[PDB]
RNA sequence: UAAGGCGCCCGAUGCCGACGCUCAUCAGACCCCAGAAAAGGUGUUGGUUGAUAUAGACAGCAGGAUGGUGGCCAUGGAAG
C-alpha cells in the first residue's frame, strides 16, 4: 500500500542516534538500510538537513528530496563542510548572489505556495534575513532594491 | 460671665439647629493627658493629572486567530 512519511534527516552524514526504527519498523523495511538509502539519495547537501518524504511500497522504499526555501539558501552558501565535533557559533558569513534569489523564487514558484513571483522574492528574502545572511546589504535595503528598481520578470 | 459645658447620672439644646463625613467580628468621642509607626485597601468620599468616544468605546458574547514556516545557528525532538 502507498504510504509517505517525513523525516527530518540529517542528510549525507550518517546519524548514530536515529529515530528510523520508531516509523519504518511496523511499516516493514529495514531501518539501518533505511538510513543508509537516505544518506545515498541526498547526497549534494553533505553537511544540511533536508525534510525528506519517503514514499514507501509493500516491497521497498523510494526517495523523493524536498527542499525548503531556507534549506535551498544554506545550500548556496559554500562554505567548508567541518568534521563532527561541531565548534560553536558556526553561524555564517559570506556572499549570496542576486541570480540564486530568483533561482529558488521560481523553485517556490512551481512549488505553488506563494504570491506571485513579486511577492515570491521578499518571502525568501524574508527568510534570507532568517538564515542570517546579507545580499550587500540586508532586507531592509533590500527594500530599497525592491522598490523603483525590482528586478521582476 | 469666664474657661468649660447642655441624652442620663448632672445645672443647661425637650433648638421642628445648619451642611456634610463614617459601619468598625478592636468604631470613635476635646489642651497638658495618659497610648502607636512604616506600609497597605477595587471600603467609601473628594480632588489632581493624562489618555479614550457617531472617524464609535469599555466589558460582553460570536468570528479570522494564519503564511515564507514545520524559520533557522540547532539540542534525540521543540513545528507558538
Request: glycine letters at 10%; hydrophobic letters at 35%; proline letters at 5%.
Given at each position: 500500500?502507498?504510504?509517505?512519511v517525513?523525516?527530518r534527516?540529517?542528510?549525507?552524514?550518517?546519524?548514530?542516534?536515529?529515530?528510523?526504527?520508531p516509523?519504518?519498523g511496523?511499516?516493514?523495511?529495514?531501518?539501518?538500510?533505511?538510513?543508509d538509502?537516505i544518506?545515498?539519495?541526498?547526497?549534494?547537501?553533505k553537511?544540511?538537513?533536508?525534510?525528506?518524504k519517503?514514499?514507501?511500497?509493500?516491497?521497498?522504499?523510494?526517495?523523493?528530496?524536498?527542499?525548503?526555501?531556507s534549506?535551498?539558501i544554506i545550500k548556496?552558501?559554500?562554505?567548508?563542510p567541518?568534521?563532527?565535533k561541531?565548534?560553536?557559533?558556526?553561524?555564517h558569513?559570506?556572499?549570496?548572489?542576486?541570480?540564486?534569489?530568483?533561482?529558488?523564487?521560481?523553485q517556490?514558484?512551481?512549488?505553488?505556495l506563494?504570491?506571485?513571483?513579486?511577492?515570491?522574492?521578499?518571502?525568501?528574502?524574508?527568510?534570507?534575513?532568517?538564515?542570517?545572511?546579507?545580499?550587500?546589504?540586508?532586507?531592509?535595503?533590500?527594500?530599497?532594491?525592491?522598490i523603483?528598481s525590482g528586478?521582476?520578470?
Amino acid at each position: 500500500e502507498i504510504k509517505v512519511v517525513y523525516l527530518r534527516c540529517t542528510g549525507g552524514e550518517v546519524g548514530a542516534t536515529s529515530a528510523l526504527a520508531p516509523k519504518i519498523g511496523p511499516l516493514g523495511l529495514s531501518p539501518k538500510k533505511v538510513g543508509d538509502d537516505i544518506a545515498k539519495a541526498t547526497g549534494d547537501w553533505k553537511g544540511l538537513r533536508i525534510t525528506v518524504k519517503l514514499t514507501i511500497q509493500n516491497r521497498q522504499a523510494q526517495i523523493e528530496v524536498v527542499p525548503s526555501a531556507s534549506a535551498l539558501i544554506i545550500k548556496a552558501l559554500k562554505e567548508p563542510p567541518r568534521d563532527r565535533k561541531k565548534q560553536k557559533n558556526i553561524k555564517h558569513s559570506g556572499n549570496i548572489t542576486f541570480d540564486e534569489i530568483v533561482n529558488i523564487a521560481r523553485q517556490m514558484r512551481h512549488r505553488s505556495l506563494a504570491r506571485e513571483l513579486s511577492g515570491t522574492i521578499k518571502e525568501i528574502l524574508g527568510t534570507a534575513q532568517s538564515v542570517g545572511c546579507n545580499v550587500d546589504g540586508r532586507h531592509p535595503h533590500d527594500i530599497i532594491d525592491d522598490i523603483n528598481s525590482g528586478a521582476v520578470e
